Amino acid sequence: SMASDMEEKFREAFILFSSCSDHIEMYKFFELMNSFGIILTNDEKAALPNDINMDYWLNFAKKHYNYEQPFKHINNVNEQNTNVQIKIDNFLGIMKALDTRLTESDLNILLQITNPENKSTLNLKTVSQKLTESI
Amino acid sequence: IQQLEEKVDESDVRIYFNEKSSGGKISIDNASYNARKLGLAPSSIDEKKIKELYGDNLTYEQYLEYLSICVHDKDNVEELIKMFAHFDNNCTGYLTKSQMKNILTTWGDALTDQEAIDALNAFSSEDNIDYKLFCEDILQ
Amino acid sequence: SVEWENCVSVIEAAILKHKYKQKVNKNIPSLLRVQAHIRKKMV
């Protein structure tokens, strides 16, 4: 099933973000779920256990993942700012402005998955499509 | 190749083929079984290389070629531990059985949970595994 | 904007996961040799 075929990628990602531990630190669990486009409300966060293991993650992921639009939250800004070809510079400006953990080198990896070589026009619907393709 | 003739028993090459051949040909799966019985260690890379050349079913000569690319002379403890070293977070040179099981079953030519837990129980009865020693044991 | 904060959270995290994945891929050739020798030991 869509769910069972994701379980491989969910297991891989828990191992990568926990550095192959049994239990994953909370700040790392937020990155882990965000990496598959999942965002909770503060009320859902309050119900999370502090001791998170692989099995919790796998049930959490199978329920909260959006099978049809994994990166909906990227295209939900399109309701705010409609599909526009942001300048490669203007898009870097939007990223470094909002507090971000991604370096210019990490920005190049983002450019390396999304542009790929056009180096001209980038709409948020390609970057969501490119990022789903590389799951 | 002079590296093959030196490492494997030449009579056991002929015989293992006869043990598994059919219509003058041996299946890649069987050639890999023979390679392991001879003390070689093919990967999926070695199976993909011979399949691109000859297909699923090997003549005796095609089978001798497959055994020559399965030699992998460069393999030592330094080259095997790279993935365990990556995930060793305490710099102790040990990983738990769960950690090794997850590493062996997630990536590459993944083992099944059983194949992995069997290989690890065969090496040690203790939860902490000296990954350098584990790689020494499977190499010899 | 919460919609913007959401959008960057998911992009940063998806790049992080890509970096972690491309660093374990560097180690897979090695891991195939571990798996190969295990399959040989246990034949």
Numbering used by the authors:
A (entry chain A): 0 to 134
B (entry chain B): 65 to 204
C (entry chain C): 774 to 816
Quote what the paper states about this structure.
Proliferation and transmission of these obligate endoparasites in their host organisms rely on efficient cell invasion. This active process is based on the motility of the parasite, referred to as gliding, and is empowered by an actin/myosin motor. Actin polymerization occurs between the plasma membrane (PM) and the inner membrane complex (IMC) whereas myosin A is part of the glideosome, which binds the essential light chains ELC and myosin light chain MLC1 (called myosin tail interacting protein, MTIP, in Plasmodium spp.). MLC1 (in P. falciparum: myosin A tail-interacting protein, MTIP) binds at the very C-terminus of MyoA, while ELC is expected to interact with the C-terminus of MyoA upstream of MLC115. We demonstrate that ELCs bind to a conserved binding site on MyoA to induce its α-helical secondary structure and stiffen the MyoA neck.
To investigate whether the homologous complexes from T. gondii and P. falciparum are structurally similar, we determined the crystal structure of the P. falciparum trimeric complex (PfMyoA, MTIP, PfELC) at 2.5 Å resolution. Overall, this structure resembles a similar fold and conformation compared to the T. gondii trimeric complexes, with the typical MyoA helix kink of 131° between the MTIP and PfELC binding sites. While the secondary structure elements are maintained, the position of the PfELC helices differ. The N-terminal lobe of PfELC aligns well to TgELCs structures (backbone RMSD of 2.5 Å to TgELC1), but the C-terminal lobe adopts a different orientation with respect to the MyoA helix (backbone RMSD of 3.5 Å to TgELC1), resulting in a reduced number of polar interactions between PfELC and PfMyoA. This explains the lower binding affinity of trimeric complex formation in P. falciparum. Of note, the electron density of the PfELC C-terminal lobe is less well defined compared to the remaining structure, which is likely caused by increased flexibility of the C-terminal loop of PfELC. This is also reflected in the comparison of the calculated scattering data from the P. falciparum complex structure and the recorded SAXS data with Χ2 = 3.9. S127 does not directly interact with PfMyoA, but forms a polar interaction with PfELC residue N75, maintaining the tertiary structure of the C-terminal lobe. Contrary to T. gondii TgELCs, the homologous EF hand loop of PfELC (in isolation or in complex) is bent to the other side and does not possess the residues needed for coordination of calcium.
